[PDB]
Design a protein around this ligand. Structure first.
Ligand SMILES: O=C(O)c1cc(-n2cc(CO)nn2)cc(C(=O)O)n1
Ligand SMILES: O=C(O)c1cc(-n2cc(CO)nn2)cc(C(=O)O)n1
Ligand SMILES: O=C(O)c1cc(-n2cc(CO)nn2)cc(C(=O)O)n1
Ligand SMILES: [Eu+3]
Length: 207
């Protein structure tokens, strides 16, 4: 499957793509404002994620640091990124269909649209100014808006036992972005697409 990753932000981002125990395609790349990077994701990829990283430095070997979304200091991510990270999430070719969503469960750093480029389903978007409106206690000094689990480490915010409800913090993310997951047990906003669809992830779709 092809994923065209487009940076419409006015700032550089370092795109990342991983399924947690391996890179997808090269795993990461710099995208200056306006640049597009198309990756190939293997059919059947389960639990894949794409995100933006901000304020990164990498040496000539591809090792360094990012202020949001750092994946073990690598340009080419093999693992998932450090919150806060707005997440484009997908599982492909699962009994004949693809499944996509956006999640704020690991916080929000950069606005995003995640849409099919082929027929048969809608896209999803979380493009509100979550960082600007972020509750004081969730603001990440390194940049972005943390989820409450990251900040407070409670069973209720982290849904540790599989039982939890919405919270004042989850409701903030849900108010700003109704079409993204705001906590682990949120009413799902997953979209079912035809198996083997192709996609575009756009950072700052309205900004
Ligand atoms: O065991 C680990 O340290 C570990 C494992 C995974 N895994 C993620 C997946 C797939 O969802 N499998 N291991 C991710 C990370 C990380 O992002 O730091 N770390
Ligand atoms: O760099 C890692 O391998 C790593 C870093 C973190 N950390 C993330 C943060 C910030 O929220 N602090 N450590 C968690 C994990 C894991 O759970 O596997 N793994
Ligand atoms: O503590 C962790 O979360 C962690 C630790 C290691 N470590 C591996 C080694 C061996 O040299 N030491 N920490 C790898 C990872 C990961 O790849 O996600 N994660
Ligand atoms: Eu780890």
């Amino acid at each position: 499957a092809t994923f065209e990753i487009v940076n419409r932000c006015s700032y550089t981002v370092w795109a990342a793509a991983s399924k947690g125990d391996a890179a997808l395609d090269a795993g990461g790349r710099q995208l200056n404002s306006g640049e597009s990077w198309t990756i190939n994701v293997e059919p059947g990829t389960n639990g894949g994620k794409i995100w933006a990283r901000t304020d990164c430095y990498f040496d000539d070997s591809g090792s360094g640091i990012c202020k949001t979304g750092d994946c073990g200091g690598l340009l080419r991510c093999k693992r998932f990124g450090r919150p806060p990270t707005t997440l484009a999430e997908f599982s492909l070719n699962q009994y004949g269909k693809d499944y996509i969503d956006i999640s704020n469960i690991k916080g929000f750093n950069v606005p995003m649209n995640f849409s099919p480029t082929t027929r048969g389903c809608r896209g999803v978007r979380c493009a509100a100014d979550i960082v600007g409106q972020c509750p004081a206690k969730l603001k990440a000094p390194g940049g972005g808006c943390n989820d409450a689990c990251t900040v407070f480490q409670t069973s209720e915010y982290c849904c540790t036992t599989g039982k939890c409800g919405p919270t004042e913090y989850s409701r903030f993310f849900k108010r700003l972005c109704p079409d993204a997951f705001s906590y682990v047990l949120d009413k799902p906003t997953t979209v079912t697409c035809p198996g083997s669809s192709n996609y575009r992830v756009t950072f700052c779709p309205t900004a």
